[PDB]
Design a protein around this ligand. Structure first.
Ligand SMILES: CC(C)Oc1cc(C(=O)N2CCC(N3CCN(C)CC3)CC2)ccc1Nc1ncc2c(n1)N(C1CCCC1)c1ccccc1C(=O)N2C
Length: 125
């Protein structure tokens, strides 16, 4: 099988806006995670073809990655911050579903998730 198309990063039917919280998600949260030593497997969609995982997209029906989130933020795709937070959580959860507890990639995702929650918590009033 081919890979699926990546998640949409624009949609002419979906109202969009810029907000202070969404700006923080791009300038602080995404930027911090993007630069982390463990970011690289998450900076683009899972290429199931390259990685020889014919079942990845049989098991993961809601794929997400930081390259997609980066583009969504840059494109002002979202209406609210909780939509973006959900995208990060989908990304982490997909990793935990496909892989086993304690796997190398799961520990990497767990470290990114800890950092993610810390940056969200730091969002100033
Ligand atoms: C599109 C490209 C990037 O996709 C890749 C490139 C390479 C690969 O062989 N690379 C050469 C060395 C280089 N290093 C060089 C030294 N630098 C210091 C860091 C970068 C990094 C890139 C490996 C995996 C890539 N893609 C990938 N993308 C996503 C992965 C995932 N791997 N892993 C690996 C992830 C690892 C464990 C499971 C998974 C493997 C099996 C099942 C699931 C996953 C998985 O869940 N994820 C998130």
């Amino acid at each position: 099988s081919m890979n699926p198309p990546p998640p949409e990063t624009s949609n002419p039917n979906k109202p969009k806006r810029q907000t202070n919280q969404l700006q923080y998600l791009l300038r602080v949260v995404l930027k911090t995670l993007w630069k982390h030593q463990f970011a690289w497997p998450f900076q683009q969609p899972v290429d199931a073809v390259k990685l020889n995982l014919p079942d990845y997209y049989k098991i993961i029906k809601t794929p997400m990655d930081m390259g997609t989130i980066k583009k969504r933020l840059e494109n002002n795709y979202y209406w609210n911050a909780q939509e973006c937070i959900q995208d990060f959580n989908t990304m982490f959860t997909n990793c935990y579903i496909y892989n086993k507890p304690g796997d190398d990639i799961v520990l990497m995702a767990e470290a990114l998730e800890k950092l993610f929650l810390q940056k969200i918590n730091e969002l100033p009033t």
